[PDB]
Amino acid sequence: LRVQFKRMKAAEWARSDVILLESEIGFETDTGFARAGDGHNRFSDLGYISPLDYNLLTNKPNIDGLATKVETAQKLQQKADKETVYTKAESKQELDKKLNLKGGVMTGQLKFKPAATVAYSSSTGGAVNIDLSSTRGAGVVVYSDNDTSDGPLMSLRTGKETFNQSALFVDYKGTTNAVNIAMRHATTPNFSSALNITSGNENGSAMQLRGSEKALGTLKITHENPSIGADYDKNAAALPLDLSKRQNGAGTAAQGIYINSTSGTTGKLLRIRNLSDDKFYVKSDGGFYAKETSQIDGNLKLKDPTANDHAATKAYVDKAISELKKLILKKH
Amino acid sequence: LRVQFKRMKAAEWARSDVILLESEIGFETDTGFARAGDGHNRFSDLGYISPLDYNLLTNKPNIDGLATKVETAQKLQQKADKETVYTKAESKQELDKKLNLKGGVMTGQLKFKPAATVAYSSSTGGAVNIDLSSTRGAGVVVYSDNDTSDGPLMSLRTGKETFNQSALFVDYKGTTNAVNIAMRHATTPNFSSALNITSGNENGSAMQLRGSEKALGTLKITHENPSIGADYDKNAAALPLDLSKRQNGAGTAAQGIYINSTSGTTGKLLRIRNLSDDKFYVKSDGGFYAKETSQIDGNLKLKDPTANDHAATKAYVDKAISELKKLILKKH
Amino acid sequence: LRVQFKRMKAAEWARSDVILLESEIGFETDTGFARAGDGHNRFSDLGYISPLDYNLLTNKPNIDGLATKVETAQKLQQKADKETVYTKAESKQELDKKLNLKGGVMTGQLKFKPAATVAYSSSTGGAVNIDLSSTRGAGVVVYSDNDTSDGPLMSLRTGKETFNQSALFVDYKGTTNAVNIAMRHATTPNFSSALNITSGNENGSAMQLRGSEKALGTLKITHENPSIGADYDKNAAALPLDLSKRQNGAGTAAQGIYINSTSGTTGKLLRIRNLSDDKFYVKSDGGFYAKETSQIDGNLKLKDPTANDHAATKAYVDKAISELKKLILKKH
């Protein structure tokens, strides 16, 4: 036999009242599908003659091997966005603008404005502290090979009249010179000074100097001729003082050189020699000594003579003259 | 006809011995599915009357377009976790705490403790090296407008007695003053000094000074009256020395002023003038000159007179007196 | 009945000319599947007797819940690769090599080579600017407790002969000493100096000093015996000058001490005292005073006597002698 089954379009069955007997097959002509009845339900409620369940399929894929939207998002949440992170290059770029501890080159100004913890006292104080105890190099080196400038190499300035510290303070222990100033014998000459000092304070000495030398001068001044010409430096002097009055003032009464010995000295107060030969000196007691002929454009007030080599007085002459006068006048 | 087929529950077939002929259909009443026999196999081993193969389905999805767990994880492995990376903000935060090469403001102390490569010698040495050869600004500028402080602006200190370098060393070439110290004429006066120097070393001069001036003083001291009152500075002096003994000592024999010329000079060793007029001077040979009347509270030991204007001696008077005595005494 | 259907292998149907009537079932013996005809199409073009449409399956999975390759890649594109980002550790590593503004420790050299904006003038200039107006600490502190070294603590050097600024410049307002130099009384003695100054410039004074003291010395020199032995410092002096010629030169004519008062002074130009007692002095007018007996190894040229206590001249003696001679000679 060639069996044919109850048949009509899917659309047609869906509204038909035909009840297929149990296991009787129904055929959807427009789809080609079929359904079997259970003897009581209408076509549209029967099920197809073969499974339609995903769990029953063969060759299914690996669904569990696939990533879920949620799963991925959770993981992506832990990852850093490009926009909120610097690239190694950008980091390098910003780091190269910073100074290394190992050292570097500043091209701008470095200002110091200390909060000041307590800023100490002694060998660990200072905005800038340099300890050279373990190296043999220099501490601060400042130089200029420029033809001119509008400022000094180093400048120290205090402002208040109550400032109770020093500008510069040197505590020195060693075998050489503490402060060494050397003004190179210039090329284009100038009328300057190696060290220039000015004080407007009237109650304190411009410069104070105390030494405890055994066989030297506290202050040793040495002038050396700048020429080989015997009398080139005939205007020079090792030490020249000037006592001058004030700007539109009335005058001055200051003294030139004041020598004193508050505790009493034994030596000579003023000793003047040439080629290491005493030529003039003022002993500690006041008596002076002069090696060569001298001159006074005035009179000399002194004690009468007692020795044959003493300068004689008017009174001494007039007395000897008078006595001779009396002596001689006997007459006849 | 209304064909009905061999039928029983899925559970029932699974254990039945009924062998469906080839192509004969079997019907599962509780599921509604059917299977056709191959003429030898039991129901449970037949297959459904329609495919159950995922590869055969229509409208399948895009399985290959879906991401695999493995695939994603491999990619996520290359990505940087949030927890192990600084955000641009955090980076900025840490970078702003660092000093720029362009310059900045230090608010704390900067200590230097040089490893010391060799720390050089000359114009590239120093923990801090400042080269002002191409700019016109200052090098180191240190100032304080505070009313007081517990420390100095700049302090240099060496510790060992064998230290063979100087605290401060100035090598100067230029047209102005190498070191310029200026102590402003104070407001609240003090009994200080612009420059104060003290040496405890007995084998070396407190201060050494050498110059090669053509027409000046190596050391030029100038005192200017602080007042317009003619005799306000009657106690002052340009230069005052003091020769004092030690703490609970026995005395001192030091000399005040020592002038010498080891190579022999032509000039005047001591020249004292007023208004640029010679008033007193000690020639190079020792002879002195005095412009006005003088006084000696004692005797003067000198050579006999040869000129009519020479101070005469005792011996000269007594001789002329004696000769006149003899001369006169003839008598009768 | 036991119905059997038209049947043959899938391979066999695919090339058969058999036309199954509408709803007549065909059976693939090698697969076990079946197809129903539509009365005109060949077997291979009929469809299976049950759906094969993914949309129709039950228990489908959550396909939309799965992540797409595209979707993931787009998201991963925003994330930062490990290879192009520094880890917090690497960042810390590089940041710890940089100096903090709060301060730190330099272990290398810090060079300054100012672009120089204009580098100012006054209290904000300098490569290094230190403002201590709000703290009581030190500014620059430089010390060395090393036994020796090959360089100085601080060194300033200018190169051109046209340099128109000073090496070091101190502007000081306060109650103490501007520059304070102290050379500790050495352990291993040396033949140095606290301050050593040398000038090769012939047109300017080695050292210039100006003060406006009311009752002091501009320059105050004090020598204190280093011993308690009364005559230990019998070679010393507070101030010793030396006038020397040049290297293989001809001689020198320089002067020792030059005292002048360009504006005219009232005081004593040279005052020498012992225990605060005048022993010798040269008045402003040139007349000198000597407390004790003196000596001249030569002659003294002076004015004739007018007072009984004036040193008498040759001429005065010879005149009084002559007058007595005439006077006496009357005879008989």
- Please name the helix (run of DSSP H) or strand (run of DSSP E) that holds residue B174, with its range, or none: none
Q: What secondary structure does DSSP assign to B283-312, as a single string?
A: -TTS-EEESS-EEESS-EE-PPP-STTBBP
> How far is C-alpha C294 from the geometric centre of its chain's CA atoms?
61
Q: Which residues contact B95 (CB under 8 A, 6 or more apart)?
A: A94, A95, A98, C95
CA angle A282, A284, A288 (to 5 degrees): 25
Asked whether C296 and B302 are in contact (CB, 8 A), the reply is yes
Residue B59 contacts A where some CB pair is shorter than 8 Å: no
Strand runs (DSSP E) across B140-178, as ranges? Answer: 140-144, 154-158, 168-172
- Please name the helix (run of DSSP H) or strand (run of DSSP E) that holds residue C171, with its range, or none: strand C168-172
Resolution of this deposited model, Å: 3.5
- β partners of residue B28: B8
State the Cα–Cα distance between residues C314 and B304, nearest whole angstrom. 9
Q: Do B108 and C95 touch (CB under 8 A)?
A: no
Of A34, A112, A321, the CB nearest to C131: A112
CA-based nearest residue in chain A for residue B96:
A98
3-state SS track over chain A: CCCCCEEECHHHHHCCCCCCCECCEEEECCCCCEEEECCCCCHHHCCECCCCEHHHCECCCCHHHECEHHHHHHHHCCECEHHHCCCHHHHHHHHCCECECCCEEECCCEEECCCCCCCCCCCCCCCEEEECCCCCCCCEEEEECCCCCCCCCEEEEECCCCCCCCCEEEEECCCCCCEEEEECCCCCCCCCEEEEEEECCCCCEEEEEEECCCCCECEEEEEECCCCCCCCCCCCEEEEEEEECCCCCCCECCEEEEEECCCCECCCCEEEECCCCEEEEECCCCCEEECCCEEECCCEECCCCCCCCEECEHHHHHHHHHHHHHHHCCCC
- β partners of residue B79: C81
Neighbours of A6 (CB within 10 A): 18
Q: Which residues contact A226 (CB under 8 A, 6 or more apart)?
A: A185, A232, A233, B212, B213, B214, C200, C202, C246
DSSP state of C280: E
Note the residue count of chain B.
Answer: 332
- Please name the helix (run of DSSP H) or strand (run of DSSP E) that holds residue C247, with its range, or none: none
Question: For residue A328, which phi and psi values (nearest 5 degrees)?
Answer: -60, -40
Show which of residues 192-231 on chain A sit within 8 Å of chain C, judged by CB atoms. 192-231
The separation between the first and the last C-alpha atoms of chain C, rounded to the nearest angstrom, is 223
Q: Which residues contact A45 (CB under 8 A, 6 or more apart)?
A: none
- β partners of residue B258: A271, C240
- Please name the helix (run of DSSP H) or strand (run of DSSP E) that holds residue C95, with its range, or none: helix C88-95
CA-based nearest residue in chain B for residue A203:
B191
> How far is C-alpha A25 from the geometric centre of its chain's CA atoms?
105
Question: For residue C177, which phi and psi values (nearest 5 degrees)?
Answer: -85, 125
For A208, B33, C103, C277, the CA distances from C10, given in Å and listed in that order, are 127, 22, 90, 150
| Number of domain units in chain C | 1
Show which of residues 126-185 on chain A sit within 8 Å of chain B, judged by CB atoms. 126-146, 148-185
DSSP state of C37: B
Provide the 3-class DSSP secondary structure of residue B318: helix
Q: Which residues contact B16 (CB under 8 A, 6 or more apart)?
A: B8, B42, B43
Q: What's the burial of C113, exposed, middle or buried (CB within 10 Å: 0-12/13-18/19+)?
A: middle
State the Cα–Cα distance between residues B110 and B98, nearest whole angstrom. 13
> How far is C-alpha B318 from the geometric centre of its chain's CA atoms?
82
Q: Which residues of C are annotated as a binding site?
A: 161, 173, 177, 196, 208, 235, 255, 260
Q: Which residues of A are annotated as a binding site for L-ascorbate?
A: 161, 173, 177, 196, 208, 235, 255, 260
Closest CA to B46 of B54, B35, B55: B35
Structure tokens at A140: 């601060």
Range of the domain at B131: 1-332
Neighbours of A175 (CB within 10 A): 18
- The dihedral region occupied by B155, where left means phi > 0, alpha psi between -120 and 50, and beta the remainder, is beta
Residue type, B311: A
Q: Which residues of B are annotated as a binding site for L-ascorbate?
A: 161, 173, 177, 196, 208, 235, 255, 260
Q: How far is B44 from chain A (nearest CA, A)?
A: 15
Question: For residue C158, which phi and psi values (nearest 5 degrees)?
Answer: -115, 145
Residue B5 contacts A where some CB pair is shorter than 8 Å: yes
Show which of residues 253-282 on chain A sit within 8 Å of chain B, judged by CB atoms. 253-276, 279-280
Closest CA to B316 of C323, C299, C297: C299
